[PDB]
Amino acid sequence: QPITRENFDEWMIPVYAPAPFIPVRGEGSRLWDQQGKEYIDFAGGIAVNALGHAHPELREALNEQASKFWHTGNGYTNEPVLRLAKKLIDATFADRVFFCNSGAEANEAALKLARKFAHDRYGSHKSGIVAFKNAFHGRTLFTVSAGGQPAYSQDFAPLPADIRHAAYNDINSASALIDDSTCAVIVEPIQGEGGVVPASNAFLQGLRELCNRHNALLIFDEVQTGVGRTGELYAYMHYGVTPDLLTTAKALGGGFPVGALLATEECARVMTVGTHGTTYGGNPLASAVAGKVLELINTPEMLNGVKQRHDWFVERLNTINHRYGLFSEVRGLGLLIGCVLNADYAGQAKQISQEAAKAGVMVLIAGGNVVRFAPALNVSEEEVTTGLDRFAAACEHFVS
Amino acid sequence: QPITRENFDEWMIPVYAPAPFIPVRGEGSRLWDQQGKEYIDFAGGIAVNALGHAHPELREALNEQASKFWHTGNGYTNEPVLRLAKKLIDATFADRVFFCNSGAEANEAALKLARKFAHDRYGSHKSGIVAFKNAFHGRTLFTVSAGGQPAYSQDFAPLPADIRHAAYNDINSASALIDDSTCAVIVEPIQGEGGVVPASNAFLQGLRELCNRHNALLIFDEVQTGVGRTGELYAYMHYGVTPDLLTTAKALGGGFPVGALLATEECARVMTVGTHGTTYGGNPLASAVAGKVLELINTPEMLNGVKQRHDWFVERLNTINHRYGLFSEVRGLGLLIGCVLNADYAGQAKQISQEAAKAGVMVLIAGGNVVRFAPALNVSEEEVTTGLDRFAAACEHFVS
């Protein structure tokens, strides 16, 4: 009758090795497990819970809609999805929006759009997708092939063709591969799963120029960096560089699964009826929640609060690092932050993460070499201080 | 300030041409638009709203969970997702489950699993996927290439390689393509988007034998046919044939986006840590709702009620067809039903569907030649009678 962690190994296809403990409830940046142990949540659902757990406003938005209707599919549109498209359109470089269920699906849409756009304006010979080493764009066949970790793509071959990977942050690597045959350049403004590595300002200017020069669409995968995470609504705003396509998901639904492709008028025009689609994308429920999310997150008091919190994190992480000497650098932007291990401790991010869990704070990794922080954007000063106290206890246990 | 249908053409990437009217609320099999016109909903969200609109029980399940927590991502499991895995395991041939956000993602998982399984037990040369003409498996690059409507895949080339299509319901077509190099045979037990065409009993026995003989995994895409739609929990039960992998989505979450891959112990074992994944899949919210759905749908009174309703539909559709002579045949199973147009009216399913909307009933199409019905499983006798009255009015207007 009771549910146990041993139940997980018996019943789930074993793609994840999750925590020994099982969460049963949360509020804000706190989470509790079956035994009532209390965690401070700096993982934030992997950058998804931008307003923390069980937020009262997301809850009324969800239940208000849920009492009218949840879903019709896309033969019918709805008021929530349309208010949401509008909020996005007004807030970003975008003119049109397409909604779906996840980051992976949004990137699939973006790449398909790019392929179609080049076939239609230039010719069927123009198919190349240029992405970057260590990129993560999701787990579908297409998006994992565009993603730059061959370990996640090897087994599933033959992979869609005409994808090449340049070195992140290397403008020369990219120009080597970008030419008149390229339809798309897909890039994360900050590499998330790949070590929390920010783009340099030059690198994104350079890509934009290469795109212009060669008529490829520039796609920014802001699935991990979007919706306030950097201190601005999107990273493209921080950098000053405008993409042709922008994918967003994750924080956008603050816990409810949703993704979006933002596009210029020129690009959208090309996706005609029946050329793509989704069954659940743009449903009333998801749209009512993301709508509320945008409204709460897209305010100067929140966004400025993100930069404030960045400083809380960085200051205290350095104090900590000065004492214990784990990290060679602390990097990232707003509230996507990475502590990179120095060579003494290389490859042990996971162990530190497990130590943190024992001390009662949830952090992530980003490769074996980086401890990743992605707390809720409305994380309180007190939760930050407590959670960093626990993280420090953890670093102590770990150093031995 | 008010939201209008003209707003849809201004703001959405135009992949859908939805209805002139916009739904604002529903209850059961009734839906209302902005002007308060009343529709009977035989489209049921494209076979998704198995318990109709804004169902009171789905609502408390949703709000109960939503007050504990919505999401952590998969470094952490949860009680809802585990109760759900268990319900499924107990109810089906499956031993293990993997959860995701949609049918498309579930099929991506299934095919990737199959590719990996063959690479691991036989060798990297064994990669072939055999699917069928007119199959629909979703809109990712991989699943649309496995899908059998070249119009939806052409523009996005180069497509993943080693996919071939046999003729549905043709055992000889399939044996021509299935050999020792095949890793997977993916099939819909009833082709949904492709004309509501049921599989013959022979055809699925035959595929199962071919699979066994050649060591390919048999995958049944029950995304459209699963969760009661046929009168049994899944179509594989109606047919007597057990697949190796089963994908399900759609009705499973009764409106909330969710998909699942059901697998035998032998197959699951092969998907090791980090080989696949999803950010939202298996989240508490989705799992609490599908859990309730399964509990309401997987009962002899519902399932038997589905067969009862099948008869209501078929009887009255024939009365109607005898009067107006639109349809050459009425086909399908349980509450997935197709009225196939005779040659006089070929290609005009969409027009009939538009006539139906004017008369105040929502039906679907399945190609230009078939009017498709997928009402909620708990559709009441009265809603069925009223909606078929309106459908009949519609058929009258249409015949001229």
Numbering used by the authors:
A (entry chain A), B (entry chain A): 3 to 402
Reproduce, without paraphrasing, sentences from the article in which this PDB structure was first reported.
Escherichia coli possesses two acyl ornithine aminotransferases, one catabolic (AstC) and the other anabolic (ArgD), that participate in L-arginine metabolism. The arginine-succinyl transferase pathway of E. coli provides nitrogen for growth via a series of succinylated intermediates. In conclusion, the E. coli AstC protein, involved in arginine catabolism, is a PLP containing transaminase that is structurally similar to the related protein ArgD, which is the transaminase enzyme used in arginine synthesis. From the biochemical data, it appears that AstC and ArgD are biochemically similar, consistent with the ability of astC to complement an argD deletion. Both have comparable steady state kinetic values, with a strong preference for the acylated ornithine derivatives AO (AstC and ArgD) and SO (for AstC, at least) over ORN itself.
The native, non-tagged AstC that was purified from E. coli was the apo-protein, with no bound PLP, as suggested by the lack of color of the purified protein, and confirmed by a UV-Vis absorbance spectrum, which showed no absorbance in the region of 320 to 500 nm (data not shown) which is characteristic of PLP containing proteins. We were able to obtain crystals of the apo-protein, although they diffracted to only medium resolution (2.75 Å). Consistent with our spectrophotometric data, there was no electron density for the PLP co-factor in the crystal structures of protein obtained directly from purification. The A and B protomers in the asymmetric unit differ substantially, with the A chain having electron density for almost the entire length of the molecule (Gln3 to Ser402) and the B chain starting at residue Ala21 and ending at Ser402. The B chain also has no electron density corresponding to two loops in the A chain from His142 to Ala163 and Val274 to Gly283, respectively. The two protomers do not form a dimer, rather dimers are formed through crystallographic symmetry for both, the A with another A protomer and the B with another B protomer. The loops missing from the B protomer form part of the dimer interface; analysis of the PISA output shows that the A–A interface buries about 4763 Å2 whereas the B–B interface buries only 1906 Å2. The St-ArgD structures are most similar to the B protomer of the apo-enzyme structure of AstC reported here, in that the N-terminal ∼23 amino acids of the structures are missing as are six residues in a loop from 277–282. The reconstituted enzyme was more heat stable than the apo-protein; holo-AstC and apo-AstC had apparent Tm values of 46°C and 43.5°C, respectively.
